[PDB]
């Protein structure tokens, strides 16, 4: 051993808790030295005072379950992610996948920073009044880099390896299941930085906050015939979230959204997060 | 006996006498990347004496009508020391940190600061005021350097999220009657085991005066705030020529 210098802790493990905590009986306590009601919030730790260290309690055996607040149950509810309309006019649309254009499901997913899950999509299709007609349709998922279709009768619709679904409008809605398909180990909804290299100028200001690990290509629908169809189409997509893992919670947004890609807000009417009252003593 | 503390790492030492405890964010200590989670093939470098030491940034001045400040990491350390040179010659880095914030005053001043650590702190703009502009913040704002930038609307943290629930992040307070230093230890948090040090900011550090500073006329009116940081388990990989920014 010619060099003595080159030869040279987790805090808390998790546990299974099906129901809420019980309450143990307590009596009065008069003494010095022991004081559980005085805390110190400057340490960044929450208070650990329970009921029995403050008041006198009875014995309570509660069987209230904690199943409902698991994150698998919080997210397993299909919500609307897109509305696609074919009035555009040439019998086909291309819709680049961006699932944050509706504020209800966006506020739930933006509670966490990182998330990793499986999805399940459902496609509800009708005319713009709800009336159904017999008409054949085709949806195609285009991964990033593949050639996207440019016409109703293009060669891209031959779907030799792209997954496609054929359906007619008088069916039940179509349902598929998607894996976790990122190059990274989780999706992230907030990306602080620029994706590219180089000296940043005004032209580089338009790139801030764009993570390339979340771009999943386009999604193309069309009517399968080769001439003009006489009907209008309106498609709605709903998404469930299964097998969820989530990391690092965040504050929840209190201002209304403006755009799909950035946290910009309307700076004139800053909405207060609480409703105001007249005087502080009289509620 | 718990009020005093001393932190020594590298060839530097911080001593304090009016301290709260030390906060370890999410109960995890910074460590090296194990071979199960690693993906890059080449051997990483670990200097660990010249880069794991306390670095002291500039000094702000707490006025009676201050808004707040924010710093970005590891943007603050890309131009100083041996850390700033290894980050320019390499392509990937991975590190934890240790932030220490000093602000002292007398027994006749009063105030309260909230020191919090928010990962992936993406900024926002007021959309031109009217709300019809798809504007974007400039480069001097998103990456302010080792000087740091001030907040314009601290109630929404310039990001649309309220200050009232900033305490869900790992945080401490500086109450001027009890303590005068706050200290948080941050591990490496990302979806990837390594990342570039010039394109991506891991977390941000916010210091916001919740209760405003007050004193009487005749007392000391220059109350400064100082931030001091130290990398913990820094590794670098992917050698290259120097890229300045």
């Amino acid at each position: 051993d010619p060099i003595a210098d080159m030869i040279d802790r987790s805090l808390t493990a998790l546990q299974v808790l099906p129901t809420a905590a019980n309450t143990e009986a307590s009596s009065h306590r008069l003494g010095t030295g022991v004081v559980p009601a005085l805390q110190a919030a400057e340490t960044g730790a929450s208070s650990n005072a329970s009921d029995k260290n403050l008041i006198e309690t009875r014995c309570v055996l509660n069987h209230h379950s904690t199943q409902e607040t698991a994150i698998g149950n919080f997210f397993s509810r299909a919500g609307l992610v897109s509305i696609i309309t074919m009035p555009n006019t040439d019998g086909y649309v291309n819709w680049d996948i961006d699932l944050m254009g509706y504020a209800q499901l966006r506020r739930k997913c933006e509670l966490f920073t990182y998330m990793r899950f499986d999805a399940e999509f459902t496609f509800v299709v009708a005319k713009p009044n709800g009336v159904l007609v017999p008409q054949l349709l085709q949806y195609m998922y285009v991964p990033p880099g593949a050639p996207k279709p440019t016409s109703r009768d293009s060669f891209a619709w031959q779907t030799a390896t792209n997954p496609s679904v054929f359906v007619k409008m008088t069916d039940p809605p179509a349902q598929v299941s998607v894996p976790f398909m990122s190059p990274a180990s989780a999706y992230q909804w907030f990306y602080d930085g620029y994706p590219t290299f180089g000296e940043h100028l005004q032209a580089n200001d338009l790139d801030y906050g764009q993570c390339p690990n979340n771009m999943m290509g386009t999604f193309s629908i069309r009517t399968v015939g080769t001439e003009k169809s006489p009907h209008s189409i309106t498609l709605r997509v709903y998404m469930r979230i299964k097998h969820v893992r989530a990391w690092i919670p965040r504050p929840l947004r209190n201002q209304p959204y403006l755009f799909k890609t950035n946290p910009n807000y309307k700076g004139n009417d800053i909405k207060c997060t609480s409703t105001s009252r007249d005087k502080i003593t009289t509620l | 006996s718990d009020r005093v503390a001393q932190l020594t790492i590298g060839n530097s030492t911080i001593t304090t006498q009016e301290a709260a405890n030390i906060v370890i964010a999410y109960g995890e200590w910074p460590e090296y990347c194990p071979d199960t989670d690693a993906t890059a093939v080449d051997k990483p470098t670990r200097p660990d004496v010249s880069v794991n030491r306390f670095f002291t940034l500039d000094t702000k001045s707490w006025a009676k009508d201050s808004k707040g400040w924010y710093w970005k990491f590891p943007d603050v350390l890309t131009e100083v020391g041996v850390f700033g040179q290894n980050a320019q010659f390499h392509y990937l880095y991975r590190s934890g940190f240790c932030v220490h914030v000093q602000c002292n005053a007398s027994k006749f001043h009063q105030g309260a600061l909230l020191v919090a650590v928010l990962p992936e702190y993406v900024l926002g703009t007021i959309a031109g005021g009217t709300g019809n502009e798809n504007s974007h913040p400039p480069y001097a704002t998103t990456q302010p350097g080792q000087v740091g930038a001030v907040l314009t609307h601290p109630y929404v943290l310039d990001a649309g999220i309220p200050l009232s629930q900033l305490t869900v992040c790992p945080h401490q307070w500086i109450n001027l009657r009890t303590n005068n230093c706050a200290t948080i230890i941050v591990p490496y948090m990302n979806t990837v085991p390594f990342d570039s040090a010039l394109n991506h900011c891991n977390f941000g550090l916010l210091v916001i005066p919740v209760v405003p500073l007050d004193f009487n006329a005749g007392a000391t009116s220059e109350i400064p705030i100082t931030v001091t940081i130290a990398p913990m388990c820094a590794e670098f990989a992917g050698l290259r020529q120097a890229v300045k920014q």
Partner: antibody, heavy 120, light 108 residues
Framework: EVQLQQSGPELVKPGASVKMSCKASGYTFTDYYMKWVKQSHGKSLEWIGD????????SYNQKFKGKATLTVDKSSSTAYMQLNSLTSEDSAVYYC?????????????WGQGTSVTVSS | EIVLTQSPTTMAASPGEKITITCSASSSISSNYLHWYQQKPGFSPKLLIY???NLASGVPARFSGSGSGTSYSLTIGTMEAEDVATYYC?????????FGGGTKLEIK
């Protein structure tokens, strides 16, 4: 090959809004940026602003902010420039160009060049 | 804003003679963001020179330039005059990026 196709010249009165729209093809619209340059008579060419087609992020010159707004739609491969509060002094030729990749941020392809004239 | 003074305003020379077109910038700027453009009469402009020394495809290699700091020059010294046009130097290091004053030439 890659060529930029613009719209024809449009005549309106002072105090009304008008639209000008240039469309490109032959390459992927999402990968490259788009700039708008204004060339007036007796002056040099002047930069209005540039725009990212992927997210709709925008930018404007500080003399032209409030004068004209930029926007884009991703599917139809079109980027159009709205002109509000026109005076007689805005009568010039407007070019749309794209930024280059291997170049050091240089415009390499330009449009046909649309023209606006303003009179009563 | 950053002003570009492109000098002279007029030019008339013979074939085979040197043509020197000078731009003067108020601030010392980065040389690699400077560009040169060529406008055929009645047609859209065309990029000639990027990086102040290099050329795009479709351009003969007679065009070159060398400049640093305040003064910036581009030089053509060849015989053919099928390209009579207006020339603009466009800097892009500082925001907003602005063009030059303008230089047009005439032949004999």
């Amino acid at each position: 090959e890659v060529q930029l196709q613009q719209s024809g010249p449009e005549l309106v009165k002072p105090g009304a809004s008008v639209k000008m729209s240039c469309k490109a093809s032959g390459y992927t619209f999402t990968d490259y940026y788009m700039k708008w340059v204004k060339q007036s008579h007796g002056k040099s060419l002047e930069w209005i602003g540039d725009i990212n087609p992927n997210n709709g992020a925008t930018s404007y010159n500080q003399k032209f902010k409030g004068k004209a707004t930029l926007t884009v739609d991703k599917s139809s491969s079109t980027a159009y420039m709205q002109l509000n509060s026109l005076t007689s002094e805005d009568s010039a030729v407007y070019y749309c160009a794209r930024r280059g990749y291997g170049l050091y941020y240089a415009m390499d392809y330009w449009g046909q060049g649309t023209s606006v004239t303003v009179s009563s | 804003e950053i002003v570009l003074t492109q000098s002279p305003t007029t030019m008339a020379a013979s074939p085979g003679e040197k043509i020197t077109i000078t731009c003067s910038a108020s601030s010392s700027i980065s040389s690699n963001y400077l560009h040169w453009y060529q406008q055929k009469p009645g047609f859209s402009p065309k990029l000639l020179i990027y990086r102040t020394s290099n050329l795009a495809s479709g351009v003969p290699a007679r065009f070159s330039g060398s400049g640093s700091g305040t003064s910036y020059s581009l030089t053509i010294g060849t015989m053919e005059a099928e390209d009579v046009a207006t020339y603009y130097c466009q800097q892009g290091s500082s925001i907003p990026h602005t063009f030059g004053g303008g230089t047009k030439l005439e032949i004999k």
